[PDB]
Amino acid sequence: QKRKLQVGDKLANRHGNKGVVAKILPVEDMPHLPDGTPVDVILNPLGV
């Protein structure tokens, strides 16, 4: 069973910033650098 990220799944980083994907956005949304490249994941500061 191939799986694929899903709202409800949980991503973590090496510094213990666990959390659930709660919304996938289409690239039309998503903050993007000036060059055009979009970001990928939008992580909340209030977490820090």
Partner 1 sequence: GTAFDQRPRVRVGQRVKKGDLLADGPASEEGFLALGQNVLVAIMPFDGY
Partner 2 sequence: YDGRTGEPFEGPIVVGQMFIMKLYHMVEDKMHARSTGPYSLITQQPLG
Partner 3 sequence: LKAPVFTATTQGDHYGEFVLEPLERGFGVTLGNPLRRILLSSIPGTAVTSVYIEDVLHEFSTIPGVKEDVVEIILNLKELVVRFLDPKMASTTLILRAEGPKEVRAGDFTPSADVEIMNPDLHIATLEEGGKLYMEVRVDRGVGYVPAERHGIKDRINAIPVDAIFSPVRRVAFQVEDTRLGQRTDLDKLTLRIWTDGSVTPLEALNQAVAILKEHLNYFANPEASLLPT
Binding stretches for partner 1 (CB under 8 A): 11, 22-23, 31, 37-46, 48
Residue whose tokens read 């060059």 = 35
> Could you tell me the sign of the dihedral formed by the alpha carbons of 36, 20, 22, 46, in that order?
negative
How many angstroms separate the CA atoms of 21 and 12, rounded?
10
Q: In the complex, which residues of this chain contact partner 2 (CB under 8 A)?
A: 3, 5-14, 18, 25, 27-34, 38-39, 41, 43
Residues 1-48 that bind partner 3 (CB under 8 A): 2, 4, 26-29, 32, 34-37
Binding site for partner 3 (CB under 8 A): 2, 4, 26-29, 32, 34-37
